[PDB]
Amino acid sequence: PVTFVPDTPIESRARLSLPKQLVLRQSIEVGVWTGETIPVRTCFGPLIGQQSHVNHIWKIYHNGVLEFCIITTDENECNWMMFVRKARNREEQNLVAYPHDGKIFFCTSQDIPPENELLFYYSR
Fold it and tell me: Which of 25, 33, 53, 55 lies deepest, with the highest CB count within 10 Å?
């Protein structure tokens, strides 16, 4: 009898896009953790998600009008940044999330040692 060898399964786009210096593990529900030190002023982006002109919605304004929302729910429609959870307080927070040129970027507020969860808050 013949034995069958399957293809290597294909992971979702969100997962494949993950920077090698980061890992996915359960959040404080999947979250993004550091596999090594991430220096202050390290920037990630832009966010990729489903564009449409809950808890997973980014608002893009342009010249004072809400142009569209990015929704970050579907692993096939987003990059890895859909996995980054929102800090629950100002202590825990280590990424600032902000629009630039109509796209969302996350930037480290401080050096983040290995084995820390990435946790965002909005800029001012």
Answer: 33
Q: What is the resolution of this structure in A?
A: 2.2
Amino acid at residue number 85 = R
CA distance 5 to 58: 42
Coil, strand or helix at 10: coil
Method: X-ray
> Is the peptide bond between 46 and the residue preceding it cis, with omega within 30 degrees of 0?
yes
- Please, what's the b/e burial string for 41-61 (b: 16 or more CB within 10 A of its CB; e: otherwise)? eeebebbbbbeeeeeeebebe
- Domain edges within the chain: 1-124
What single letter denotes the amino acid at residue 121?
Answer: Y
